[PDB]
Design an enzyme around this catalytic site. Structure first.
Site, PDB file in Angstrom:
ATOM      1  N   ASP A 195      81.595   6.811  56.345  1.00 50.84           N
ATOM      2  CA  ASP A 195      82.214   7.304  57.432  1.00 50.84           C
ATOM      3  C   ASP A 195      83.711   7.535  57.513  1.00 50.84           C
ATOM      4  O   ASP A 195      84.196   6.954  56.515  1.00 50.84           O
ATOM      5  CB  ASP A 195      81.755   6.434  58.818  1.00 50.84           C
ATOM      6  CG  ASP A 195      82.118   4.961  58.559  1.00 50.84           C
ATOM      7  OD1 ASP A 195      83.194   4.559  58.332  1.00 50.84           O
ATOM      8  OD2 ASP A 195      81.095   4.278  58.796  1.00 50.84           O
ATOM      9  N   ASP A 197      87.051   6.813  59.892  1.00 53.82           N
ATOM     10  CA  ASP A 197      87.409   6.068  61.083  1.00 53.82           C
ATOM     11  C   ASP A 197      88.848   6.337  61.803  1.00 53.82           C
ATOM     12  O   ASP A 197      89.768   6.500  60.339  1.00 53.82           O
ATOM     13  CB  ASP A 197      87.346   4.664  60.988  1.00 53.82           C
ATOM     14  CG  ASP A 197      85.828   4.219  60.431  1.00 53.82           C
ATOM     15  OD1 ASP A 197      84.845   4.810  60.962  1.00 53.82           O
ATOM     16  OD2 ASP A 197      85.552   2.931  59.882  1.00 53.82           O
ATOM     17  N   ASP A 281      84.153   7.886  63.452  1.00 53.66           N
ATOM     18  CA  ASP A 281      84.332   6.872  64.448  1.00 53.66           C
ATOM     19  C   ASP A 281      85.842   7.170  64.916  1.00 53.66           C
ATOM     20  O   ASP A 281      86.812   7.014  64.325  1.00 53.66           O
ATOM     21  CB  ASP A 281      84.055   5.520  64.303  1.00 53.66           C
ATOM     22  CG  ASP A 281      82.577   5.154  63.810  1.00 53.66           C
ATOM     23  OD1 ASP A 281      81.544   6.004  63.960  1.00 53.66           O
ATOM     24  OD2 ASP A 281      82.716   4.437  62.883  1.00 53.66           O
TER      25      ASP A 281
HETATM   26  O1  LIG Z   1      84.856  -1.685  54.760  1.00 58.31           O
HETATM   27  C1  LIG Z   1      84.883  -2.676  55.350  1.00 58.31           C
HETATM   28  C2  LIG Z   1      84.325  -3.833  54.863  1.00 58.31           C
HETATM   29  C3  LIG Z   1      83.769  -4.360  53.540  1.00 58.31           C
HETATM   30  O2  LIG Z   1      83.633  -3.447  52.724  1.00 58.31           O
HETATM   31  C4  LIG Z   1      83.972  -5.892  52.988  1.00 58.31           C
HETATM   32  O3  LIG Z   1      84.626  -6.904  53.338  1.00 58.31           O
HETATM   33  O4  LIG Z   1      83.325  -6.171  51.853  1.00 58.31           O
HETATM   34  C5  LIG Z   1      85.078  -2.551  56.692  1.00 58.31           C
HETATM   35  C6  LIG Z   1      86.059  -1.423  57.157  1.00 58.31           C
HETATM   36  C7  LIG Z   1      86.047  -1.120  58.628  1.00 58.31           C
HETATM   37  C8  LIG Z   1      85.761  -2.226  59.721  1.00 58.31           C
HETATM   38  C9  LIG Z   1      85.258  -1.250  60.506  1.00 58.31           C
HETATM   39  C10 LIG Z   1      84.289  -1.447  61.479  1.00 58.31           C
HETATM   40  O5  LIG Z   1      83.314  -0.642  60.923  1.00 58.31           O
HETATM   41  C11 LIG Z   1      84.324  -2.438  62.477  1.00 58.31           C
HETATM   42  C12 LIG Z   1      85.713  -2.902  62.702  1.00 58.31           C
HETATM   43  C13 LIG Z   1      85.809  -3.958  63.732  1.00 58.31           C
HETATM   44  C14 LIG Z   1      84.980  -3.907  64.894  1.00 58.31           C
HETATM   45  F1  LIG Z   1      85.055  -4.661  66.047  1.00 58.31           F
HETATM   46  C15 LIG Z   1      83.903  -2.992  64.791  1.00 58.31           C
HETATM   47  C16 LIG Z   1      83.576  -2.236  63.747  1.00 58.31           C
HETATM   48  C17 LIG Z   1      85.988  -0.045  60.165  1.00 58.31           C
HETATM   49  N1  LIG Z   1      86.842  -0.469  59.178  1.00 58.31           N
END
Ligand SMILES: O=C(/C=C(\O)C(=O)O)/C=C/c1cc(C(=O)c2ccc(F)cc2)c[nH]1
Ligand code: NA
Length: 357
Positions: A195, A197, A281
């Site tokens: 996705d 964001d 998102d």
């Molecule tokens: O890519 C990774 C993690 C792995 O790859 C790893 O630790 O291995 C996270 C990226 C990320 C986090 C998010 C959420 O979806 C998100 C964040 C906060 C929330 F409250 C609800 C949804 C968007 N950017």
């Protein structure tokens, strides 16, 4: 000395220990599916620390002094050194429950409970699920099945940039002073993602203008015939509440979308229907909380978990996506940038591309 905390480590995308971490990631994922939170956490922390190493493990001696490597994890590393593969991770990859849970949750709108339900009904393929005449699907799952091939294909950077252009053009139409930032994996330097964001904030918008932006932007796209799916979660944000003690939940207004991305908008090196469905998102936050939201949405998930754990256990501070609270000084700490959040925590600044924990 390597810290046990990902927020005190620099984790770049040059993973020298993919042989070990791919196995540990599979074992952690299986423990998540089997509802074994403790074993899941131990494998995630071990995988995370190995991802930070500037060299590949080539003998058991190389693991000396590395934290988060318990006896179970060291036996898995030993076996990979011996054979070049993990017998434990190979068994998970051949497990019928694991295979079904991976396959079913690869559909947008399908979580652990629906995947378990379908597995216990005897389903093993997406073809048999989709063509069943008795099954009832949520509107999220219907979109998940309709645009499955596009959503299962990786979003690349030219596509993410094309989506960024669309987001910025739509947002500035209603709030011309708004700041739109691409977050998640792409902000950390990743070539691909599931996705795209974005964090949206406006220094002059009112509380009502801030609330209405995601509704205005999605209505505009609906009119344009670009909105394939839309779910807007209203804010449950509380300006004066203490940050989460929990994996912290985000209470900002957000939307989970599927957008129609026309191929002409993508400026890549490279066909079909002429468009691609993209999971997007959008997060709207008050201007004064933009640094906390940016830090939370940039990730990685492991970097966020360790940041919050470090804040609690080492600094007696409470951190989440909305604020930073000092329990000793009994005051909320202000930040105009991520650098100021790191400084408040007594951490050396970790660049976004160094947060791939
Ligand atoms: O890519 C990774 C993690 C792995 O790859 C790893 O630790 O291995 C996270 C990226 C990320 C986090 C998010 C959420 O979806 C998100 C964040 C906060 C929330 F409250 C609800 C949804 C968007 N950017
Ligand atoms: Na899913």
């Amino acid at each position: 000395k390597i810290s046990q905390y990902a927020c005190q480590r620099r984790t770049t995308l040059n993973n020298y220990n993919q042989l070990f971490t791919d196995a540990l990631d599979i074992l952690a994922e299986n423990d998540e599916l089997r509802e074994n939170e403790g074993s899941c956490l131990a494998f995630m922390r071990a995988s995370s620390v190995l991802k930070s190493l500037p060299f590949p493990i080539t003998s058991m001696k190389d693991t000396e002094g590395i934290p988060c490597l318990g006896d179970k994890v060291k036996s898995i590393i030993e076996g990979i050194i011996e054979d070049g593969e993990s017998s434990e991770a190979k068994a998970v990859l051949n497990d019928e429950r694991y295979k079904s849970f991976k396959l079913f949750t690869s559909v947008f709108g399908v979580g652990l409970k629906t995947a378990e339900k379908w597995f216990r009904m005897g389903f093993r393929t997406l073809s048999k699920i989709q063509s069943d005449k008795s099954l009832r699907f949520t509107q999220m799952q219907k979109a998940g099945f309709l645009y499955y091939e596009d959503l299962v294909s990786c979003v690349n950077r030219p596509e993410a940039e094309a989506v960024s252009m669309l987001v910025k053009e739509a947002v500035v139409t209603f709030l011309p002073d708004a700041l739109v930032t691409m977050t998640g994996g792409f902000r950390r330097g990743k070539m691909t993602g599931h996705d795209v964001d974005f964090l949206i904030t406006s220094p002059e918008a009112t509380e009502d203008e801030e609330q209405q932006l995601l509704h205005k932007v999605t209505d505009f796209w609906k009119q344009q015939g670009l909105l394939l799916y839309c779910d807007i979660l209203e804010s449950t944000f509380e300006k004066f509440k203490q940050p989460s003690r929990k994996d912290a939940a985000d209470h900002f207004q957000k939307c989970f979308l599927i957008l129609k991305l026309d191929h002409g908008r993508v400026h890549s090196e490279k066909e079909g229907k002429g468009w691609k469905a993209i999971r997007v998102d959008l997060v709207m936050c008050p201007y004064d909380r933009r640094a906390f939201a940016l830090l939370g949405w940039t990730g990685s998930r492991q970097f966020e978990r360790d940041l919050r754990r470090y804040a609690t256990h080492e600094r007696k501070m409470m951190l989440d996506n909305h604020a930073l609270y000092d329990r000793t000084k009994r005051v909320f700490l202000e930040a105009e940038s991520e650098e100021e959040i790191f400084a408040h925590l007594g951490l050396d600044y970790i660049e976004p591309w160094e947060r791939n924990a």
